[PDB]
Design a protein around this ligand. Structure first.
Ligand SMILES: *[C@@H]1O[C@H](CO)[C@@H](O[C@@H]2O[C@H](CO)[C@@H](O[C@@H]3O[C@H](CO[C@H]4O[C@H](CO)[C@@H](O)[C@H](O)[C@@H]4O)[C@@H](O)[C@H](O[C@H]4O[C@H](CO)[C@@H](O)[C@H](O)[C@@H]4O)[C@@H]3O)[C@H](O)[C@H]2NC(C)=O)[C@H](O)[C@H]1NC(C)=O
Ligand SMILES: *[C@@H]1O[C@H](CO)[C@@H](O[C@@H]2O[C@H](CO)[C@@H](O[C@@H]3O[C@H](CO[C@H]4O[C@H](CO)[C@@H](O)[C@H](O)[C@@H]4O)[C@@H](O)[C@H](O[C@H]4O[C@H](CO)[C@@H](O)[C@H](O)[C@@H]4O)[C@@H]3O)[C@H](O)[C@H]2NC(C)=O)[C@H](O)[C@H]1NC(C)=O
Ligand SMILES: *[C@@H]1O[C@H](CO)[C@@H](O[C@@H]2O[C@H](CO)[C@@H](O[C@@H]3O[C@H](CO[C@H]4O[C@H](CO)[C@@H](O)[C@H](O)[C@@H]4O)[C@@H](O)[C@H](O[C@H]4O[C@H](CO)[C@@H](O)[C@H](O)[C@@H]4O)[C@@H]3O)[C@H](O)[C@H]2NC(C)=O)[C@H](O)[C@H]1NC(C)=O
Ligand SMILES: *[C@@H]1O[C@H](CO)[C@@H](O[C@@H]2O[C@H](CO)[C@@H](O)[C@H](O)[C@H]2NC(C)=O)[C@H](O)[C@H]1NC(C)=O
Ligand SMILES: *[C@@H]1O[C@H](CO)[C@@H](O[C@@H]2O[C@H](CO)[C@@H](O)[C@H](O)[C@H]2NC(C)=O)[C@H](O)[C@H]1NC(C)=O
Ligand SMILES: *[C@@H]1O[C@H](CO)[C@@H](O[C@@H]2O[C@H](CO)[C@@H](O)[C@H](O)[C@H]2NC(C)=O)[C@H](O)[C@H]1NC(C)=O
Ligand SMILES: *[C@@H]1O[C@H](CO)[C@@H](O[C@@H]2O[C@H](CO)[C@@H](O)[C@H](O)[C@H]2NC(C)=O)[C@H](O)[C@H]1NC(C)=O
Ligand SMILES: *[C@@H]1O[C@H](CO)[C@@H](O[C@@H]2O[C@H](CO)[C@@H](O)[C@H](O)[C@H]2NC(C)=O)[C@H](O)[C@H]1NC(C)=O
Ligand SMILES: *[C@@H]1O[C@H](CO)[C@@H](O)[C@H](O)[C@H]1NC(C)=O
Ligand SMILES: *[C@@H]1O[C@H](CO)[C@@H](O)[C@H](O)[C@H]1NC(C)=O
Ligand SMILES: *[C@@H]1O[C@H](CO)[C@@H](O)[C@H](O)[C@H]1NC(C)=O
Ligand SMILES: *[C@@H]1O[C@H](CO)[C@@H](O)[C@H](O)[C@H]1NC(C)=O
Ligand SMILES: [Ca+2]
Ligand SMILES: [Ca+2]
Ligand code: NI
Ligand code: NI
Lengths: 5, 1048, 6, 350, 5
């Protein structure tokens, strides 16, 4: 539940 | 959450980050709490007289549970310790306890209305995974889990006696217990209130009610009456929602109007304050509208059949709306008045720079009749520019050009006659006069300006990359003020305000109802009547008549028509597009007003076929659907005189030239070839010849009679891949195009030498050609252009471009009465003009003979020479699904001996009875319900007469002409049985594992049949079924067929 | 399960 | 960079060995470099803008060395244009092209290929004049070049007169001089001939790659061999100046073993996984290195928990310092001078 | 097939 490409 | 005492309705919106209230009828809604709230999830309220209090839960960056008076005044925070994800709320009315829940800390707790006596019902327990909502009852609490996807029950005081109420496949979100005890009664102070619109309960002791009014309304000093707020506001459209925010930067509420949610790809909006409507486009090619309070959110009209619209601008005086269609490279208009919508294309993409290259923005000036738009340009003559034109589309002009890469929307300041626009490549906002004289940079160092609007003394712009809406002084660009910030997906802007049509009247307002369909103002106070798409203005200047002369350009996605005069950009036909269109060629029927085309699809069936439609888009019907080859219909030619439609359907290794008499089922094949592949076919009723092009091995152009019997070659040397051909009737030349040779050439019908009309590198891929008057018109696939040039060879004038940037061009045809003459003198006294020449099925004229050669769709032509009857000869018969069909023995005869007979069920086997001239055939229905029937071949041709029903599946049948009894085999029942020709007596001949076929030799007393069971063999027995012996019983596996030859 | 109801 | 003199979106290159000048055609960038024809010394020193204007769909550039004039094609206008290397005289040579892709000037003729006309044509280099078609009906046409004899004797410069002058790279400059250069991740020594590693530079980390840029803005070279390629998704990076290492943490929500902490030297050697085992559902969300004690601090981000951990470099000892549930430390910085840890929290109660 | 798009 976070930032990814 | 409903308010059962005050008859109100409260809800929390996570996307809008507001808490809103309205009447229980869904009317007069307003934003109740919009301050200091981030993610409101829960909601509960106590309408009883002693409390009049509401509770909500917010799980923002600082989670809290808050209470307030039901009119939103006395707001306090009651729970802000030991909470991470407040999710769900419920109230225990008898003892006044508020139950709440947490999905991160995984507990259920309750408190009093002050949040003091805090207790844990369920805590430090694994029964909770991700609970969402709860409701109460007598000593029981029910809640839903989104993690385990089940609804639970527990004791509401200590969490004991737990059990699973329900398992749900999907996540259970909401839950309520329905019972009067959950909804205690009380006195209604609001019932005595005189408040207009909304009357909201409150916790203040003297009255316990407070008057309120919806978004966009003003609270008068009477404290009970509200008046509509006529002050302006800014409509901030975003990628998925349109907000109306106040012009005052200190007001952060975003409730000037009811938000327009559910937008697909928002770009810009447009409004009509006369009826308080807000307009925006949708992706499928539609325009939607809604009132400022959300009353009549509906679709309004279709915009374009061949692409979605991007720009939007409204004329509030003539009540017309203009829009841009970058997918179609056009600027169009639409009519608001009346119950019938009328639309027209004003400017299109011709070759000239004055045309429309790629329209982005559009701004209209109703007075002075001027229309301005910003153009991105093309990889063609059209550069990036700010252009102007009259609202009737006549006087195209280029105002500003230069370093305008990545242009954005253009905005007009009507009061000052100043154009405003933004340039992304330099990150600036520029302005200039409407006459194109002055230009200066107003705002610098922007990232990606998207919207801008001028109102009063300020210029508002929204930057999509800074995520900011900013107000600046329009005169110098100084004194920047930020309205919104950190708002993603920022799109265009527009200021809603009251603008009177009376103060800005024009020609279309001083003279209403003058034009039949559309009125368009022009400079000088005048007006210009116009007609919808597909109609031409009559010389009287008021009425409308359909186009009688236009060219039909054929593309893969759509079929479109253009006027022959290059100064007219109107769409001369209602475009044929949408689902299922993949069209190869088109042809016209000028006299009757029909346009034919052939659709093609390599994978899905029911897409191949020939279809017809009127040039106004009425009575689309299919023409040819059955029997299309694998490669589909590859050419369409219509004989306007005889009413015959010639087409070529290509199979994998064969291709046929076929005729269909229009409005009738008469269809027959003229020619079947394998070495040749005729692809594009044209017909000439005047010279009575049939031409076609061939681009397979040995390419050529062939000429033949109308019945395909005198085939001769016109061109066979120096020709590869002739895509299409056309004819000029007044001169008798055949024009064709070669994409493999970059060649356009012509030749006379009688033959001779080929004349090169045009050739060279500048003609890469000509795909279709037509001749009109002194000029040829052709389309080019590579260049995406429709050209016009002189027909005479040796001309060196550069071709003029009719339209540009049309993708997937295939063909072009002329729709004109002059191109399809009907008078007998102009058709060289062609027969078949009157009563089809007397022929019953087909009327084929011959080049110099005065009497037509009648053709027969089924059967043979009688001695009368104009009537058809059954073949009266020997021929084959075969069964095909639900029909019995016929075929001649001669491979070179394509006429049907008799018309196809339609039967019920599927026909499997058949046999012929000479004496009564009938066919005994068998049928298969369902899995096991076989049937046997007979049908007569005489002129009566009644429905097949059934002999039996409820018998098993029958694989074969044979008829005894000597003994007049019928032998048939039943597969599903493993017997071969016999019957009389009337039915009547029936007997069993033998038992067989898998019988399929039967043959008889009555003059020798023997009968043969085949078997393909566990052991496959061919057996012989007497017609009585005695002395059964196997004739061949080796090397056989599936002996399906049997035939006996008495002649050898 | 994530918090957002969408 | 932000200046108009930098490269925005370069398409074509022409080199002039003698007189040592590069030439390139640029499409420009939004709010940055315009679409222009630019020139520079072949070592990259003196950026210059020669021609700017109606160039939108600019194609490759080419140079006629004998006449010293630049040629280019503009698709948005369908023309082929000429221009002196001085940037003064500019004119339109060919008209009514469809989509020029490649062009070359040799001898007295100019050859261009049109991808949309599917043709290769020859015209004079002074004007269109005698148009001649070499090939036609050729699909998928692209750039062109003329293979011909050019020798090192007909034109010479510093790098040809002085072989073995520079140990790694030699780049000629106008006037016959030569400038030495040292690869990527290396800096020119004060002697001007040998190479040394880039002692001082800055590290920027992107999701696709980790890259190094020099502090002095005039140096456009890469100060560190980029860390890129398959399996790279970088969240944070930290440096070890004394031992010459760069530590970064990869992230991947779906594929495992793409999560962890890696090390690499600025010259691209000695790649090694530092932390691989025990990564949380969300990867290592922050990294901090103690350059005095040799400790490495990092944050594990589990779904409902967050750990702060230590790892002694070149050593298997790994310890958990803090376990929190309502607080979520994300980015850690360590200060050995004052002996403190600072971390940022962006969950509830930031 | 010969042409479909
Ligand atoms: C319902 O409640 C709202 C909010 O209180 C009221 O809205 C205000 O209405 C007044 C009167 O129409 C507006 O006053 C006018 O403002 C104009 C400029 O406003 C812009 O700039 C200011 C800051 O400079 C901003 O605050 C504002 O948001 C705008 O961006 C002036 O140009 C007007 O002056 C002209 O008229 C006056 C009065 O006739 C003359 O004295 C002047 O000489 C000049 O001719 C005027 O002052 C006010 O701006 C509105 N506020 C908002 C938020 O828009 C509604 O009026 C109220 N409705 C009712 C019917 O009660
Ligand atoms: C197969 O079946 C289709 C129908 O399914 C037939 O199509 C019809 O064809 C006839 C012509 O043969 C069409 O009739 C024509 O309609 C035209 C439009 O009428 C409107 O406009 C006129 C003024 O222009 C008004 O007067 C009228 O009220 C309507 O508003 C007329 O302009 C045509 O008039 C011409 O012929 C008549 C005689 O028929 C002359 O008196 C006139 O002077 C003029 O020359 C004509 O009336 C009919 O509309 C078509 N119907 C449909 C549904 O399309 C096919 O003809 C038929 N055969 C083939 C081979 O396809
Ligand atoms: C974990 O383990 C790794 C190995 O896996 C260690 O990495 C090594 O760390 C040492 C630290 O000293 C590195 O050694 C240093 O190399 C530098 C580069 O050497 C080049 O340039 C010098 C001239 O400047 C030449 O002499 C040499 O031949 C090379 O061309 C040197 O500049 C450093 O010099 C320092 O130490 C020397 C010797 O004591 C002194 O004379 C100098 O004055 C100066 O103080 C030094 O030699 C080594 O290169 C690293 N190897 C790898 C594989 O990267 C890590 O240090 C270790 N981790 C921790 C945290 O301890
Ligand atoms: C919104 O929430 C903030 C944060 O609690 C409130 O800001 C504080 O309000 C209290 C009220 O007594 C003041 O004592 C503090 O000084 C305020 N701090 C700041 C940074 O302003 C704010 O009052 C709340 N606003 C509303 C309308 O609820
Ligand atoms: C589940 O319900 C049962 C009763 O059916 C509860 O059992 C009694 O609870 C009361 C109140 O605490 C006690 O005084 C009795 O001694 C209990 N009797 C028995 C048979 O245990 C039980 O407490 C409930 N579940 C839980 C875990 O509380
Ligand atoms: C907007 O919505 C209202 C409510 O549906 C529409 O008003 C109704 O119109 C129908 C049909 O004319 C009438 O039978 C009802 O009596 C109307 N109800 C009310 C509340 O007046 C209204 O027509 C809509 N606006 C428009 C122009 O479409
Ligand atoms: C082959 O024959 C069967 C009947 O044996 C056809 O099935 C009928 O199809 C039509 C639609 O075209 C339905 O409306 C009927 O209800 C069907 N009848 C039965 C008895 O199922 C079938 O369509 C035929 N196949 C083709 C390709 O035409
Ligand atoms: C295949 O057919 C032949 C037909 O003759 C069968 O041969 C006969 O077999 C019977 C029983 O063995 C003998 O009494 C006859 O004399 C045979 N006839 C001749 C002339 O050979 C043969 O048996 C059949 N094969 C099978 C497997 O049924
Ligand atoms: C042609 O169009 C109109 C409108 O649908 C219709 O009423 C008329 O019946 C149509 N003609 C035929 C023959 O279907
Ligand atoms: C048509 O074909 C017939 C038979 O081949 C031939 O005799 C005749 O000359 C041809 N042309 C004409 C004018 O009928
Ligand atoms: C086979 O004969 C049976 C009874 O001997 C009869 O019931 C049936 O209709 C026949 N075939 C079928 C349809 O099963
Ligand atoms: C580091 O790199 C060098 C050269 O690639 C190699 O020879 C050496 O073994 C490596 N040492 C370690 C410890 O990785
Ligand atoms: Ca949980
Ligand atoms: Ca070609
Ligand atoms: Ni943009
Ligand atoms: Ni290009």
């Amino acid at each position: 539940x976070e930032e990814x490409x | 959450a409903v308010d059962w005492i005050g008859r109100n309705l409260y809800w929390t919106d996570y996307a809008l980050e507001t808490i809103e209230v309205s009447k229980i009828d869904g009317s007069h809604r307003t934003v109740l709490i919009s301050k200091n709230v981030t993610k409101p999830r829960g909601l509960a309220l106590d309408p009883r007289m002693g409390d009049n209090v509401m509770f909500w839960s917010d799980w923002g960056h600082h989670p809290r549970i808050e209470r307030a008076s039901m009119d939103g005044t006395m707001r306090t925070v009651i729970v802000q310790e030991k909470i991470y994800w407040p999710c769900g709320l419920s109230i225990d009315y008898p003892n006044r306890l508020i139950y709440f829940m947490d999905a991160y800390l995984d507990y259920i707790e309750f408190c009093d209305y002050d949040g003091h006596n805090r207790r844990q019902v369920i805590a430090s327990d694994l029964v909770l995974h991700h609970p969402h909502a709860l409701t109460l009852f007598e000593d029981f609490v029910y809640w839903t889990d989104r993690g385990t996807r089940q609804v639970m029950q527990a004791n509401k005081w200590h969490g004991g006696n737990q059990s699973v109420v329900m398992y749900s496949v999907h996540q259970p979100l909401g839950i309520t217990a329905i019972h009067p005890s959950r909804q205690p009664p009380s006195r209604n102070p609001c019932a005595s209130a005189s408040c207009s619109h909304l009357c909201l309960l409150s916790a203040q002791a003297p009255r316990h009610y407070s008057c309120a009014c919806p978004s966009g309304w003003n609270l008068s000093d009477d404290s009970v009456n509200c008046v509509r707020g006529d002050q302006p506001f800014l409509m901030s459209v975003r990628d998925n929602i349109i907000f109306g925010i106040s012009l005052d930067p200190e007001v952060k509420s975003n409730d000037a109007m009811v938000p327009i949610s559910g937008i697909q790809h928002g770009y810009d909006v447009e409004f009509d304050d006369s009826e308080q409507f807000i307009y925006w486009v949708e992706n499928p090619g539609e325009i939607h509208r809604v009132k400022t309070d959300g009353s009549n959110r509906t679709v309004f009209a279709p915009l374009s059949l061949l692409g979605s619209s991007l720009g939007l601008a409204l004329d509030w005086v003539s009540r017309n709306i203009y829009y841009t269609t970058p997918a179609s490279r056009s600027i169009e208009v639409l009519t608001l008045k009346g119950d019938t919508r009328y639309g027209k294309t004003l400017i299109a993409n011709d070759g000239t720079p004055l045309g429309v290259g790629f329209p982005v923005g559009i701004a209209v000036d109703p007075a002075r009749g001027k229309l301005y738009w910003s153009d991105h340009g093309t990889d063609s003559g059209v550069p990036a520019k700010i252009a102007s034109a009259n609202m009737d589309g006549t006087s195209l002009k280029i105002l500003f050009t230069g370093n305008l890469q990545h242009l954005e929307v253009v905005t007009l300041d009507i009061q000052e006659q100043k154009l405003y626009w933004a340039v992304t490549s330099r990150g600036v906002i520029e302005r200039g006069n409407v006459d194109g004289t002055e230009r200066m940079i107003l705002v610098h160092h922007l990232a990606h300006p998207w919207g801008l609007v001028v109102y009063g003394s300020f210029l508002y712009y929204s930057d999509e990359q800074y995520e900011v809406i900013e107000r600046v002084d329009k005169s110098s660009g100084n004194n920047k003020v930020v309205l919104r910030d950190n708002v993603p997906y920022l799109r265009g802007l527009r200021v809603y305000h009251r603008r009177n049509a009376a103060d800005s009247s024009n020609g279309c307002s001083n003279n209403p109802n003058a034009c039949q369909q559309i009125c368009l103002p022009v400079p000088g106070g005048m007006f210009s009547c116009a007609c919808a798409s597909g109609f031409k203005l009559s010389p009287d200047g008021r009425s409308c008549s359909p186009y009688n002369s236009f060219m039909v350009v054929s593309m893969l996605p759509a079929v479109r028509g253009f006027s022959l005069e290059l100064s007219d950009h109107s769409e001369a036909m209602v475009p044929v597009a949408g689902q299922g269109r993949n069209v190869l060629h088109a042809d016209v029927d000028v006299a009757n007003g029909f346009i034919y085309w052939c659709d093609f699809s390599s994978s899905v069936r029911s897409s191949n076929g020939i279809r017809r439609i009127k040039p106004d888009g009425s009575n689309f019907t299919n023409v040819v659907t059955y029997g299309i080859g694998a490669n589909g219909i590859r050419g369409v030619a219509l004989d306007w005189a005889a009413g015959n439609l010639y087409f070529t359907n290509a199979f994998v290794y064969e291709t046929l030239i076929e005729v269909l008499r229009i409005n009738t089922t008469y269809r027959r094949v003229l020619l079947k070839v394998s070495v040749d592949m005729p692809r594009h076919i044209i017909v000439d009723p005047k010279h009575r010849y049939l031409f076609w092009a061939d681009y397979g091995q040995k390419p050529k152009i062939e000429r033949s009679f109308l019945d395909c019997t005198n085939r001769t070659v016109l061109v066979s040397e120096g020709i590869v891949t002739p895509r299409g051909l056309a004819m000029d009737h007044d001169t008798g030349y055949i024009y064709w195009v070669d994409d493999s040779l970059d060649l356009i050439a012509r030749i006379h019908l009688d033959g001779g030498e080929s004349q090169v009309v045009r050739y060279g590198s500048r003609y890469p891929t000509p795909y279709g050609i037509t001749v009109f008057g002194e000029s040829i018109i052709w389309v080019d696939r590579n260049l995406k252009k429709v050209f016009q040039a002189s027909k005479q060879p040796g001309n060196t004038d550069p071709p003029v471009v009719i339209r540009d940037k049309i993708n997937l061009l295939r063909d072009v045809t002329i729709f004109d009465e002059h191109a399809q003459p009907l008078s007998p003198a102009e058709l060289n006294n062609n027969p078949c003009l009157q009563s089809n020449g007397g022929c019953s099925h087909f009327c084929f004229a011959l080049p110099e003979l005065p009497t037509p050669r009648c053709g027969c769709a089924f059967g043979t032509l009688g001695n009368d020479g104009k009537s058809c009857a059954t073949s009266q000869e020997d021929f084959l018969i075969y069964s095909l699904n639900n029909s019995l069909r016929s075929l001649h023995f001669d491979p070179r005869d394509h006429s049907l001996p008799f018309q196809v007979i339609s039967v019920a069920g599927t026909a499997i086997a058949l046999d012929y009875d000479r004496r009564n001239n009938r066919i005994f055939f068998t049928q298969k229905l369902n899995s096991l319900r076989g049937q046997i029937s007979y049908v007569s071949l005489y002129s009566g041709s009644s429905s097949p007469t059934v002999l039996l029903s409820n018998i098993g599946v029958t694989d074969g049948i044979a008829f005894d002409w000597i003994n007049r009894r019928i032998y048939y085999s039943d597969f599903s029942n493993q017997t071969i049985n016999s019957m009389a020709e009337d039915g009547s007596n029936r007997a069993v001949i033998a038992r067989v594992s898998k019988p399929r076929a039967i043959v008889l030799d009555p003059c020798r007393g023997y009968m043969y049949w085949t078997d393909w069971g566990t052991n496959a063999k061919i057996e012989r027995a007497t017609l009585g079924g005695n002395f059964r012996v196997p004739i061949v019983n080796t090397s056989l596996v599936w002996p399906n067929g049997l035939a006996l030859d008495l002649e050898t | 399960x994530x918090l957002x109801x969408x």
